[PDB]
Design a binder for these strands. Structure first.
Lengths: 149, 210
RNA sequence: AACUCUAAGCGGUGGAUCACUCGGCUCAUGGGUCGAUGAAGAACGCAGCAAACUGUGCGUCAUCGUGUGAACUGCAGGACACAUGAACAUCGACAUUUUGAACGCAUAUCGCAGUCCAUGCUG
RNA sequence: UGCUUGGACUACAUAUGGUUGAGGGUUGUA
RNA sequence: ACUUGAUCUCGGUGUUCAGUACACACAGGGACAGCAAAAGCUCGGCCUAUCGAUCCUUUUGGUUUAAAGAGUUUUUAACAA
RNA sequence: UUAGUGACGCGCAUGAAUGGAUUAACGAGAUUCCUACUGUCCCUAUCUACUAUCUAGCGAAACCACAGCCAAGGGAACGGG
RNA sequence: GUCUAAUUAAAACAAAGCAUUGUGAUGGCCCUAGCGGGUGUUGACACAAUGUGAUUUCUGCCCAGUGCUCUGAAUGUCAAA
RNA sequence: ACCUAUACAUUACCGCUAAAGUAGAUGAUUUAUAUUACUUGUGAUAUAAAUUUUGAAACUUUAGUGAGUAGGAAGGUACAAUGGUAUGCGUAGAAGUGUUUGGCGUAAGCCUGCAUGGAGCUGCCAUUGGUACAGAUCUUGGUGGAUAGUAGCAAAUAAUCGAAUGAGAGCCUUGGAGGACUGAAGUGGAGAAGGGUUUCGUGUGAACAGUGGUUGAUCACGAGUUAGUCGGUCCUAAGUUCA
RNA sequence: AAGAUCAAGGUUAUGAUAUAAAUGUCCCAGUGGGCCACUUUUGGUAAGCAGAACUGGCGCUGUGGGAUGAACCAAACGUAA
RNA sequence: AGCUGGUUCCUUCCGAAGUUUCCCUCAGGAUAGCUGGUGCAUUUUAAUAAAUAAUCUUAUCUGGUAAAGCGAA
RNA sequence: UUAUUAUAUGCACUUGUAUGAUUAACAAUGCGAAAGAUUCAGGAUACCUUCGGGACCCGUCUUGAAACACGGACCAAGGAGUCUAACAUAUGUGCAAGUUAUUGGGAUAUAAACCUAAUAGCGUAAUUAACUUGACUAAUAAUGGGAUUAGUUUUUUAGCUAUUUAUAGCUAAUUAACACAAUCCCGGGGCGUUCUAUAUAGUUAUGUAUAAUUAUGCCUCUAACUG
RNA sequence: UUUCUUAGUAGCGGCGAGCGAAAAGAAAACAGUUCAGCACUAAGUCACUUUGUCUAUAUGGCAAAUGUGAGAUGCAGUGUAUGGAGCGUCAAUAUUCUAGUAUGAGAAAUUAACGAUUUAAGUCCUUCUUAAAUGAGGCCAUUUACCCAUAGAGGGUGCCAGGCCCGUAUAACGUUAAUGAUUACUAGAUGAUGUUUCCAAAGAGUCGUGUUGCUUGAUAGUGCAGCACUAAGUGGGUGGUAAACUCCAUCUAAAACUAAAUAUAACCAUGAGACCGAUAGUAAACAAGUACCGUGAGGGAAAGUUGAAAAGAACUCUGAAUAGAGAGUUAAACAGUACGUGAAACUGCUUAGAGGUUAAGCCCGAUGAACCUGAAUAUCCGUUAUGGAAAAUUCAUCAUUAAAAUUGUAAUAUUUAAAUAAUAUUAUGAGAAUAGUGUGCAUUUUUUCCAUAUAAGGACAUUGUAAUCUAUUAGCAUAUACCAAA
């Protein structure tokens, strides 16, 4: 880890003002502490760089317990990565006792998202919540979405 | 006021340097805790040092239900099919959390099968002999034949690969799911409104007859 | 020459620097052990020689019991009681002043009562 | 007895037990 | 003489100069017109000043979302201008 | 006699217990004239005792960039360099 | 008569005198968060609160303004309950 | 004509930048020769001689340029500690330190000698910091010039003859003597408030008595403060402690 | 009108140059108190005065020169012949 | 404490600004400009131009100062 | 026609000229003379001397300091851009569409090392206030197309070199593909917003009929979805 | 309860500055419960006082007085809503079972903690030095390792000590607690579950509500409290946006007991440190909360070190004496009580030199003094030619013999099946050398030394001349071309 031997503050001895300019010397809190005055002196610096700083986009949601809404997402970009790699080539086979029934829910992703374009191979996806578009491309691949606990 | 700057909601403004738990006691505690298990394992019998019988099933988070949290719940209902015997259970182990309402009776299946695949493994040692209902065996004595006493309680679970990416056979393709998924939710939203429309239709008819 | 300046050698002055340290500091671990059965703290008197520190209380630098087994030590009285014990620890038996919560009442007074038991003197 | 010395006791709040008590509180015997 | 373009909606541009905020101005896209015979012109005053951030108060807008165990209805939180 | 006192008082900006006026007695109080007096002065001088001084003994400190000859010049527009 | 011990001893302060103010005590004025208490072992010739400043003399006009006050028309204005 | 800046020209040399190669070694390259092939003259091979073991996270080789506060980056140096290491050093003299020793580096700084010394210590590669001082009207300790003496040690005149003693004697040790002082509203004779052994004898030296000092309120060693009747005590006051 | 497909074209169609340039990140320091001169100028009689325009210095710059000198002149400094 | 004072080794190389804007701002910041460092992509502007950047010239625009005018508004 | 100059001037030897910083022929003198130690040359060590020239006091704020600006008599030693939480950028390292074990447990040569259950964090979808919905195209298209860009393979030709003439490599012209990265542009598309196709139409299911909520048929009121 | 998380977030906030938690999820550790209110229905209960007994060193238990007193203005007891009690049915249901006390068992069985003993081994020679070996060197043999080793952790000891001691590793012993078995005595209980039936007893000026203040993230209250209003049992509360209506889910308040994980700057018992090293470190390493100041509250230091051993300087002399001079002691007084070591500032002396030019101090160049540093060899046109002297034997010109390696190649195995390649093993051939023999092992060779020689005994250093080279300065001497004017 650490060396103050790699610090340049070591090197700045002496250099009389240690990189903290002779005329205007670095003295404790020259611009007012923190985000102060953000309506005044730092107004340039806040809208630049943080702009939405300040007011409101109000819809106060008293007691959002983020278990109701949590809903993690898998894309239809990916979705075939739920299928173990040596079985992934095994169902490209061509052999049907089929179609591909992937349990999305036990892979922990509440919601199947739309993102588009999978191989023509039919996939049945067992998922709680649907992108209608994810289902639309799955139905074009000839599978289905079977809706799932 | 720094123009790549990181708005600092770092609340160390309240003399937080008095508090600081340095946690230089972590492995001293780990050694003590492990050492304590050794003392407890001997002291409490050939008593195998946890382990209630661990009771899971079914946590409450709709996402978090392979999220097994360990079965303290004390199961008065499940006792009955184990016949079973709340007081007798306590001597054995049976975790006393009498405040549970496990009504998803697939849950009654799992846990009752647990206690029974257990129970027969509870070697029945009574303090003179004579000793009624072991229902064991002088040959089946802890010391002589069996030598058991283990460990840690497996989540049970039961894998998780999944891969119920099994071969089904998958019929369902006349079945247009996407119309029904938005419809089912709309029907649920509009239940109170659809109730009004029936009630308003009733009222106007009563008026008309009037 | 003397003095002054400049340098050097040597001697002072002074205690920096070095190296040491029965101490300090910080983190971790085990334990719960004050008090009206009179505390913690204070005052007071105490060692053969002490004035303190330290120890102790009027039995005063310490006593039983117990352990060990011959010191203490500056000088010595002692040392003897080394085999019944030094001296240190243990310290479970006792002592543990005047106080202080502080308790008869007070306290710029160690001041002044009451009560029981008891002693000498006088009778 | 007088005169003198030593020890042990004599605070307050409070519970319980002890017994003495007490009030036109109130009851009864007369 | 006839009228209400001093309009609606969204983006740009100029000034200030971070050519940013703001205000006002300039030229357009999408509406809808106003006027005149029409071509055309016209997002206020021939051009150059004439005025204001967040929170907050409020109104107008779609009649929309939330009030986290369900509704309904008051109330209320809001998003657009 | 830029002083004072008595007058005059359109009094910049006096004044009636916000007290106004007058006033004996009183004041280590402010002020003005005269006298007596004096080294206050003209105009300086001398004297006593104790010091300062010198010596035996005893013995600090302020301050001190480096320290210390002037004149002019330039220069932070006044130099010991 | 007093004072700014340690730069101001006065013309300032106090002061008798003069006038003004509240109050009969379940009060007036006053302290204490409060309990309770000061004045007060006082009772209006008292106690408390002020202002001016002996004696002599004088005490004018003005309540519009700002204070102060009231048996005042007190359905002005006007809080909570 | 002459003089003359760190300018200008050239050259050596420093650094920084630039620009190029360097990395077949059972191999390569040079030189001489004998043999063999072809040819006039060259190569191959054999032999003998010679060079070449490159921090190729650097060197060889090259050119152009360098003020510099603020500041930035780059690379070292010193200091204390730590992992590893030099089969490190060491009481036969460590570290420390004085040093016209000799030398190295632009420097930061390094080594060594000599003297002193006495018990432990350092270089290198990585690793961490309470890491390098001239200052801060810095802190703390020490020391100068002022100044071995300049301020001063001067108010109450202030002694002095002089015997005794001692190392030394104006005082302080002291008699005798002698000048005076305070001038009983005292610099006296008592006590409270206060002091705390200071009182007193003996010993009597350094320090102290801004001087000396044999002497002292100093320093060392001993002793001494006896109460029915004086105070405290007791009592109450202003006032207080508090059930 | 753009996107644009296809075919034709002697010499690339002023001059020196390029220390290579462009581009991004740091949101980096340091700065936000300037001062002086040529020239141009406003206020002011003027000022070593207050304030612009352009450009260079000084600020951060000695050396040589103006006897001297922050700034003017000449010139920008590795070390020496 | 936006103020004053001080800040502890060296060398090498490059090297400022006192300006803009906003701010009870004006003894200060932020911000832009100037500054360094870190690099990156390509060198016919690169490793053994028919692509530019920015200064003359040229060609092509602009302007109401100096001067001039008042027998021109 | 004449003059001039160069080529036809090879091989041996050479203290010849240069070879891109070409100082040496030649010579004299001191002297290394064992340890010992002479003699010569050279030197701003400390410091002294002699001569010239130059050198004003540092630190600092300040436009400018030698200032008649401020601190600092003198000397020694302490002595000031840190640590920590959380953060951005640069870079290195590990692994990588994942990563982080050290909350804890297993274990120990011990506050270490070794092992590591399970979560959680962040990333893997965002945007609207939120409800919500979902980046379309294609297994692929490093976002698509397009324009500037490298590097490679590659058509075709020329020159050069080496060559066995089979052949390869370089350099230049050239055709095509990838052409990412880098840079630029027009779009598409998730979300919001507007105009508005979601005017209406189609499709499925409810609903109804039939057999047993479901299947089948029909309607496509209603609900849902889409251009 | 705490930790990990959520989370620098929901959310609060001149919505500015700044603030901010819990649930689920993960883990550490885990443990449960009881009144009072029902019909015990012969107060079943309890404190005390005395005496019997017992026996701690008891406010104790057993027994008796059925002695006072408490208590129906209420206590036992089932039993606590997480329910529960009584009926019947089921069900276990036994000369018993369980508990609490006493029991040391196992001829002292084991474990831990403490005191504390234990040791396995050199103080052998030499040398230095010295006060000391703990320093350096030696120590057969164990494939050269002094002895020992489960211990080479530390301190003490005269130094750098595993082996000198104590300890350390490792155990012996005693004590005390645990491991209390059987056994004795005493006390108590006979299940729990399910069905059906009968009962089903429940904390109030509180809950709640309006206000206020305070406080929180808690916002149309987050807890808390005051005040007003004030309940109820198909109640009550909760369900973070107020209400009414209609529901659902979820507990059961206004009562009580309860280990562990969780805290620890004090106290006691302990262990560590990339801690500090005497201006540091705590205020205090020390007669440190001391000395000292302040009326007091309080303020509160500076200050470590002779040596191995005091061997702390006897003795003599000068001086009143402290001191000095000699001397002793000590490895050293260059350790003689600011005492280890020993700085700077500063001062005295001595030694050198100068002194009116800036007060002094300074740098450079030249220069003198003291002082110091540097100092090389063989050749014109080359140093080889030649001669002598010594010595060598694998090699010497090379052959042979033995020894092992290298170059190239192959195989067999492994690596990567297999290939190329690499590696282990094995083998062959080419050669070169280390030892032995040999023409000779000085027939001669070779190796090694010495002398003499051509201009000359030289090139380290400093010097002369001349030829050149680069930059440059300054002349000389020679000859034209053209233009104007002439």
């Amino acid at each position: 880890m650490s060396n103050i031997k790699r610090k340049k503050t070591r090197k700045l001895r002496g250099h009389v003002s240690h990189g903290h300019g002779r005329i205007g010397k670095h003295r404790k809190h020259p611009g007012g502490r923190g985000n102060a005055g953000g309506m005044h002196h730092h107004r340039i610096n806040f809208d630049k760089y943080h702009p939405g700083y300040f007011g409101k986009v109000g819809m106060r949601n008293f007691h959002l317990r983020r278990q109701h809404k949590f809903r993690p997402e898998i894309n239809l970009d990916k979705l075939w990565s739920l299928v173990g790699a040596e079985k992934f080539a095994e169902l490209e086979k061509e052999k049907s006792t089929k179609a591909p029934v992937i349990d999305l829910v036990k892979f922990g992703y509440y919601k199947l998202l739309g993102r588009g374009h999978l191989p023509a191979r039919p996939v049945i996806v067992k998922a709680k919540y649907f992108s209608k578009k994810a289902e639309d491309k799955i139905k074009k691949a000839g599978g289905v979405c079977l809706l799932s606990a | 006021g720094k123009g790549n700057n990181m708005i600092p909601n770092q609340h160390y403004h309240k003399w937080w340097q008095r508090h600081v738990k340095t946690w230089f006691n972590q492995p001293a505690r780990k050694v003590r805790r492990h050492a304590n298990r050794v003392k407890k394992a001997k002291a409490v019998f050939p008593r195998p040092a946890s382990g209630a019988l661990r009771p899971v099933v079914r946590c409450p988070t709709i996402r978090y239900h392979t999220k097994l949290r360990a079965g303290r719940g004390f199961t008065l209902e499940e006792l009955k099919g184990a016949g079973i015997g709340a007081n007798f259970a306590k001597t054995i182990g049976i975790a006393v959390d009498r405040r549970r309402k496990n009504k998803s009776l697939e849950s009654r299946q799992r846990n009752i099968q647990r206690l029974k695949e257990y129970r027969s493994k509870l070697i029945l040692f009574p303090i003179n002999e004579k000793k009624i209902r072991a229902g064991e065996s002088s040959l089946e004595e802890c010391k002589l034949a069996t030598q058991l006493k283990g460990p840690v309680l497996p989540i049970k679970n039961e894998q998780p690969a999944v891969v119920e990416f099994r071969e089904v056979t998958k019929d369902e393709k006349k079945f247009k799911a996407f119309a029904t998924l938005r419809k089912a939710r709309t029907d649920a939203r509009l239940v109170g409104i659809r109730a009004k429309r029936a009630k308003e239709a009733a009222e106007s008819e009563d008026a008309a007859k009037g």
